[PDB]
């Protein structure tokens, strides 16, 4: 049972997925190029066929509160993993 | 069962442990202020009473290979957690 952040890291590690999700090249920044495709694959992963970006974005919002991620200012689908002791702790536990 | 990197993160998060292990304030860098005390507490955690800094340093060496941590060049007891997609993937999986 993967957490959504783990699942995104696994998709980001394969450049074959770069058409729907990719590291932008700027540090730990990544873009949901096809956000509905990212949702569909998350749906397959968790056996939730009714998964959509609306549900996926609520999960990405929870990740700001934990300090794991931040939404890049001025962007609809660009986020970054945070590299600080708080993010590390939330990812470790 | 905690991994050594998780154990260090847990010790680092609690300022009660700051007399023997602490974040330096420079990004993800941390210092083993009392390296033998870190080693003794790792021993308590894993029920390995014969734990010492020698055994700990070799396990830290294994984490450099994984790509999760690195020893700060020119320092005896200063390390850092790595901020890159490879580190994130190794910590996630």
Residue numbers in the entry:
A (entry chain B), B (entry chain A): 334 to 426
The article reads:
Furthermore, a new Ets dimerization interface linked by a redox-sensitive disulfide bond is identified, and this dimerization is shown to result in a significant inhibition of DNA binding, potentially linking Ets transcription factors with cellular redox regulatory mechanisms.
Crystals were obtained from constructs that contained the Ets domain, Etv1 (encompassing amino acids 326–429), Etv4 (encompassing amino acids 338–470), and Fev (encompassing amino acids 42–141). We also compared the Etv-1 construct used for crystallization, which contains two primer-induced mutations, against wild-type Etv1 and found no significant difference in DNA binding. Etv1, Etv4, and Fev display the typical fold of the Ets domain, which contains three α-helices (α1–3) flanking a four-stranded β-sheet, with an additional C-terminal helix (α4). Analysis of the contacts between adjacent molecules in the Etv1, Etv4, and Etv5 crystals reveals a conserved potential dimer interface that is distant from the DNA binding surface and is present in all the DNA-free and DNA-bound crystal forms. Dimerization of Etv1, -4, and -5 is mediated by the homologous cysteine residues (Cys-416, Cys-422, and Cys-449, respectively). The reduced monomeric Etv1 protein bound the DNA probe with an affinity up to 200-fold higher than the oxidized dimeric form; a C416S mutant of Etv1 bound DNA with an affinity similar to the reduced wild-type Etv1 (0.26 nm).
